[PDB]
Amino acid sequence: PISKMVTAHFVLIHTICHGAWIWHKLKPALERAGHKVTALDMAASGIDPRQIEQINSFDEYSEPLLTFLEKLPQGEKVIIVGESCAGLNIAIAADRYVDKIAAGVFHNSLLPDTVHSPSYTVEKLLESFPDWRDTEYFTFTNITGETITTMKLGFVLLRENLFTKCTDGEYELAKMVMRKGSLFQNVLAQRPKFTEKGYGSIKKVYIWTDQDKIFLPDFQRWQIANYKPDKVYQVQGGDHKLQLTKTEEVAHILQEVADAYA
Amino acid sequence: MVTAHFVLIHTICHGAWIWHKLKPALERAGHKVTALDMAASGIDPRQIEQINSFDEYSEPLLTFLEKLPQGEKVIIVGESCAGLNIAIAADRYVDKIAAGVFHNSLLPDTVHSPSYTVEKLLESFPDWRDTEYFTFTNITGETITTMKLGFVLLRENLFTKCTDGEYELAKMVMRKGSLFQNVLAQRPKFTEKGYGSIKKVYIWTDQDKIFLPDFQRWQIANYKPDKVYQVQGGDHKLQLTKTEEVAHILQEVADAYA
Amino acid sequence: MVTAHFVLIHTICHGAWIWHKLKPALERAGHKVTALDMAASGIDPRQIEQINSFDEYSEPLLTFLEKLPQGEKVIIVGESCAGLNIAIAADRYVDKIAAGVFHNSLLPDTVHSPSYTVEKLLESFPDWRDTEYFTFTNITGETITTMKLGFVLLRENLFTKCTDGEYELAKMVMRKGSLFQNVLAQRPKFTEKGYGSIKKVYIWTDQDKIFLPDFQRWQIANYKPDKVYQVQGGDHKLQLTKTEEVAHILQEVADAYA
Amino acid sequence: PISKMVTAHFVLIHTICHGAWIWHKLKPALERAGHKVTALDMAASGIDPRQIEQINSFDEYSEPLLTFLEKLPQGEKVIIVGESCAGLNIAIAADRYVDKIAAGVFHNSLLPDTVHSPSYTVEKLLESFPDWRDTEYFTFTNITGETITTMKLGFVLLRENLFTKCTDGEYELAKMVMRKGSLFQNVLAQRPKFTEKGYGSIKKVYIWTDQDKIFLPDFQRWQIANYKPDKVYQVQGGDHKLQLTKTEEVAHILQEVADAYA
């Protein structure tokens, strides 16, 4: 009747242990469409020089996102795309920069709410997938005495549960650049709940596949029921790393989100 | 067909990740593959300012080799500047090395100082375009120049023919690096008994836009390798643009030097 | 008499060595003593330019405490700037600490930022005479100022009344150091539950020529300790000039906080 | 008849594992007499920032001495005092800077000769004292493939054999600043012999005590017989670290060496 097509600025946010590198296929695909794309390493992730033992909360871990959003020009707005654990990075950012966020896109991601503790969807994830196979765990004591659990993701878990259907080159890449990570779950438990005015007001799009072998269909569906997304897009096939196994589909879905939220 | 253990060594500023396509290809043929990050490269936690020479930068290779079980031998494959890591390593562990393979790489010799081919390379390719440079003073007082490779140079000279996903990955994980050229200029020449006795295979393409044809031809003539394999096409990153080809040459090296 | 385990913490630029007279004295009374080098201090192999904050500098203390066997408690004694290491450490391990002792030391509080007493000290003693200063940028972009303490300052202000052998040792092993003051200015204040709950004993002398009487009196009034012991005479390095006296006070602290 | 008194520039050289710090009592004592004193840390010793694994020979280890002697003004000459292993540092230096050396003083030290391999007195030391008690050993591979043995001196050996009669403060100091060390003995074995024109021409004074519990009377006496010192001064009592247990005696002996050799 009147049709609309929009170009947007997407800020792509990796999950813990990973870095900006997992977006290396989706970032050129989005740029083919003319969108602007920023892919950031969070503290102690990718090639960020900080070590995880110097980081004391998931909020401190999120510093690169918040700094980048503090830096945005007046009137610029971004669509934050976060995979796996990064729905927590979107919730943290949205409670500081709601103004700057056109929409949050959850990509096989944790979907925080405002009603329960920030750690709530993490506890639910762990009830759903409690065995992290060959993952190793470590701890350190943070700046106020909390003991923080970190992990080095196991290679079998990487091969079968996160990168199930990815290329051998993509799986070898992962092994070559994967870092330690932490959920800081116990400090999240002590955290103020996400606000309604910030995070609670953001548009929220949930992309997911039922073939995800680590954020399982029962968990994903529980999250959607628990906090209704403004839109849900289920991708057929692929695996947890849909930005690698369904790069073009994900880019076409993200075009639709730009058209709807700019 | 012999299966071999290959130790793949990236160049300065890069990391084990550039071998992400070559490591599975080699493993499809039954080979064992170890891809190492050098100091302050890839995801190694050290920053470049705490490394004081190119031998300290080679530490992950030397520690690996130091620990190789007695009687095992490896084929070290090095790209670009990593021919200098092969020579450092061959001088210390000649008996653990079945052959050195140079992939569009510096090919040091025994007759001139360790920085000779770096001088030659820079003479050949003097403008590193948008690359930025920085300096720090190392622990004995020398000024070390570091660089942050420029994205136009990355796109047109290094990753000329690489996929967009590959070029984009490169920008996502590239680190600062240093040739430590002036410390190489003061370094003892590579020995004849160590580096000089190693079998040497040189892989290149005349389509490389940064180690140019006449510089690579100069190198071959300056220190003739046991075997030279020339790949047609590709770009400087043959392990990305000609992956199966390099894997096939590396199979011939395994067959020949077991 | 209770015997206690004392963890002695030197100040920036120094190392475990300043406690070389105090550690045997304490051990003559049956106490266990651990004297640690902080990052890039004494003979620690790290250089100051790779340390990025005062909490990273405190790493040898925190690792020690992290490993203390369950149920053991220590008395941490800190000189000069090391009151900041006690506060960092008390925030992370309050239950492992029987008491903090401040030996002519900064006494941080919970109400103002972590750099408050450093600002105050510098206001009090602004000219560090022949000290030289240097800067580097840490891994997140902050400019960190380092110093090399000047030998006249070492002789007249720090080691005022020390033996010539002691002053000479000091020159032989002194290292660069940093307050990381601007990073302390950005740091979360010390907590009431951790540092704020620790027992605190302040040892000083009014003959100290660098932490001057009115600055030390200001500190006591700003954050009143559980006990203040004033030693007559000596100089800033009471563990060298009043060794048996400090050992005797430290015995009273062991008796009191077991 | 005519009496002479001379002020000299002494360069004090520590043994492996130790640093310039062991001279902290003798350096003020010599300066009381008006002499000029330089005490240098050798590579990877004291607070020198290099690590022993980056050092490849006893000659490279000696760099701080040779650099300092390269730096001396025309016509200045020094008396090099070396304790324990540092007679090897004096021999290396004398083959580069004979011109700059008024005398070499061996202080319970190895006394190299020109007739045998540079490693010869080390082999003889080890036959004499083969058990280094609680010392730990390690190896690394040097720049041309030689395996180098390093050691961390044991605390009992330190207490009873090197610092036998020293103060508890002096013994605690030692433990607080002691570093790894190496003799590089196998690379010394491969080294050209010290020359007659350089080291062979230097004046040589041997200070020693028969109470030394690590360079034992039979070893010391064998060395004196093997290569006659221009003068020998035996100190009664003390221990291996005569610059700590006999600081003033050693300083008066060193005055006599200044008077005789300037």
UniProtKB/Swiss-Prot annotation, chains B, C:
Site (described: Increases basicity of active site His): 208
Effect after changing residue 208 to A: 80% decrease in catalytic activity
InterPro entries: AB_hydrolase_1, AB_hydrolase_fold, MES/HNL
GO MF annotation list: aliphatic (S)-hydroxynitrile lyase activity; aromatic (S)-hydroxynitrile lyase activity
Domain of life: Eukaryota
EC number: 4.1.2.47
pH dependence comment: Exact pH optimum pH is difficult to determine due to the fact that acetone cyanohydrin is very unstable above pH 6.5 but HNL activity was found to rise from pH 3.5 to pH 5.4. The pH of the cell sap of damages cassava leaves was found to be 5.3.
Disulfide bond annotation, renumbered to this chain: none
Binding site for acetone: 11, 80-81
Positions annotated to bind 2-hydroxy-2-methylpropanenitrile: 11, 80
Effect recorded for residue 236 to A: Loss of catalytic activity
Catalytic activity: a monosubstituted aliphatic (S)-hydroxynitrile = an aldehyde + hydrogen cyanide; a disubstituted aliphatic (S)-hydroxynitrile = a ketone + hydrogen cyanide; an aromatic (S)-hydroxynitrile = an aromatic aldehyde + hydrogen cyanide; 2-hydroxy-2-methylpropanenitrile = acetone + hydrogen cyanide
Biotech / industrial applications: This enzyme can be used as a biocatalyst for stereoselective synthesis of a wide array of (S)-cyanohydrins by addition of HCN to aldehydes or ketones. Optically active cyanohydrins are interesting intermediates for the synthesis of alpha-hydroxy acids, alpha-hydroxy ketones, or beta-ethanolamines, all of which are important building blocks in organic synthesis.
Keywords, in A-Z order: Lyase
Active-site feature positions: 80 (proton donor/acceptor), 236 (proton donor/acceptor)
Family of the protein in this entry: Belongs to the AB hydrolase superfamily. Hydroxynitrile lyase family.
Summary of the function given for this chain in its UniProt record: Involved in cyanogenesis, the release of HCN from cyanogenic glycosides in injured tissues; the release of toxic HCN is believed to play a central role in the defense mechanism of plants against herbivores and microbial attack. Decomposes a variety of cyanohydrins (alpha-hydroxynitriles) into HCN and the corresponding aldehydes or ketones; two natural substrates are 2-hydroxy-2-methylpropanenitrile (acetone cyanohydrin) and 2-hydroxy-2-methylbutanenitrile (2-butanone cyanohydrin), but in vitro can also act on 2-hydroxy-2-methylpentanenitrile (2-pentanone cyanohydrin) and mandelonitrile.
Assembly description: Homotetramer.
Protein name: (S)-hydroxynitrile lyase
Native organism: Manihot esculenta (Cassava)
